[PDB]
Amino acid sequence: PPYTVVYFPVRGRCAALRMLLADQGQSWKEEVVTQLPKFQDGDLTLYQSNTILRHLGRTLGLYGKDQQEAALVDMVNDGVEDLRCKYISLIYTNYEAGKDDYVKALPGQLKPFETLLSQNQGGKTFIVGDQISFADYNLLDLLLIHEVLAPGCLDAFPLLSAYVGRLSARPKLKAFLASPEYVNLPINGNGKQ
Amino acid sequence: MPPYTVVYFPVRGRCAALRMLLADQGQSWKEEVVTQLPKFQDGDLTLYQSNTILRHLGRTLGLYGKDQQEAALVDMVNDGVEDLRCKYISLIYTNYEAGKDDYVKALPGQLKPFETLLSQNQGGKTFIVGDQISFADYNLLDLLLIHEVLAPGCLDAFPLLSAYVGRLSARPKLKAFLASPEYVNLPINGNGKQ
Numbered sequence: 001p002p003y004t005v006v007y008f009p010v011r012g013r014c015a016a017l018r019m020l021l022a023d024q025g026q027s028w029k030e031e032v033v034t035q036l037p038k039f040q041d042g043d044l045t046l047y048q049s050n051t052i053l054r055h056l057g058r059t060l061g062l063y064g065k066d067q068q069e070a071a072l073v074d075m076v077n078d079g080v081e082d083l084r085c086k087y088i089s090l091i092y093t094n095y096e097a098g099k100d101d102y103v104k105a106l107p108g109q110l111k112p113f114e115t116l117l118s119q120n121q122g123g124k125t126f127i128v129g130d131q132i133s134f135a136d137y138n139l140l141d142l143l144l145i146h147e148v149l150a151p152g153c154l155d156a157f158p159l160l161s162a163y164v165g166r167l168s169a170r171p172k173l174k175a176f177l178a179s180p181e182y183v184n185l186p187i188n189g190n191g192k193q
Numbered sequence: 194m195p196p197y198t199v200v201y202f203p204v205r206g207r208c209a210a211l212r213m214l215l216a217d218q219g220q221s222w223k224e225e226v227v228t229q230l231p232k233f234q235d236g237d238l239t240l241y242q243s244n245t246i247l248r249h250l251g252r253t254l255g256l257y258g259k260d261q262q263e264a265a266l267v268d269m270v271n272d273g274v275e276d277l278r279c280k281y282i283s284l285i286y287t288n289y290e291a292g293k294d295d296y297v298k299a300l301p302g303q304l305k306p307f308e309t310l311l312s313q314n315q316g317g318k319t320f321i322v323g324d325q326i327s328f329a330d331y332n333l334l335d336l337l338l339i340h341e342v343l344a345p346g347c348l349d350a351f352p353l354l355s356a357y358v359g360r361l362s363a364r365p366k367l368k369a370f371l372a373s374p375e376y377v378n379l380p381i382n383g384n385g386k387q
């Protein structure tokens with residue numbers, strides 16, 4: 001249906017959603033605000049990034065092939081959101097004093113995703129099952145912003161590296177990620193990354 | 194053995210709602226006590242985190258709306274329940290004595306959106322979303338029950354929420370579970386505060 005995304009003028013908790021829409025060849029309108037995002041799909045109004053991701057998962061079939069996979073998609077997404085919460089708290093609340101210890105902790109925070117990949121067709125497909133889910137887009141965005149926070153952080157992790165390279169190369173997603181609409185938006189809204 | 198196992202602390206906490214849901218749906222499960230959680234097993238599937246569990250049971254027991262639109266509305270209601278639950282948890286463990294007066298004065302404004310939801314859905318006479326029970330109902334019921342303990346009479350400002358609690362609490366299987374030692378003899382939280 002007709003989509004509208006309302007958010008602050010940053011990537012933030014909106015980036016994964018946008019990546020998903022772009023890659024899935026959906027059209028949407030952006031409305032700027034100077035819990036979000038607010039999302040409109042016909043007469044339906046949604047708030048909160050994870051609730052929006054799940055909705056798009058159901059409607060566009062990005063939620064696993066069955067009930068069991070759906071639950072696994074949720075658990076992976078929970079793990080993405082736990083790290084993202086720690087990121088947001090670092091960025092907006094303790095960047096200076098906190099960063100050194102955050103980056104120290106970071107390889108331990110990434111390993112579980114590497115292991116998860118290692119248990120799903122040799123890490124050659126997606127984070128859950130044989131087809132992309134909303135968890136993949138969210139995990140990709142998380143990995144990308146961590147590479148800015150800590151360049152080289154995926155170097156020790158070959159499945160996660162190939163995974164980012166592979167998903168980033170899907171042609172609609174690639175075009176989106178190279179575009180100014182993505183590249184020229186700040187990651188967060190306080191100058192920090 | 195039961196196909197379900199719940200693994201948690203000896204508290205109600207984040208497990209209360211799913212236990213109520215399982216009891217109300219006439220399901221059998223095993224409790225394992227531990228001195229990420231709760232952990233939930235359903236056959237060889239292992240889940241963590243109360244909301245992911247609730248959603249799993251919503252999908253399998255048909256408690257996730259009648260269609261995709263309702264499913265998303267269930268999720269939003271659930272988000273609301275979890276936001277207030279997160280503030281409650283903050284109060285309980287972090288600032289109970291100095292914070293309680295403030296939290297209770299703010300409580301009306303936190304509760305009002307749920308009352309409004311009910312008033313927009315068949316005059317508050319069925320469930321929080323649609324005409325069938327969902328996992329958000331169980332989660333909201335628990336949040337309301339524990340706020341009645343924190344702030345007795347807090348629902349006197351909310352006629353629809355009051356009747357809703359009375360109505361859901363009277364569902365036979367759930368009623369028996371809520372009166373049972375299994376529920377009554379666990380404390381609401383882990384730090385003695387409520």
Ligand SMILES: [As]
Nearest residue numbers: 082085086089
């Ligand atoms: As956090």
Ligand SMILES: [As]
Nearest residue numbers: 276279280283
């Ligand atoms: As909170």
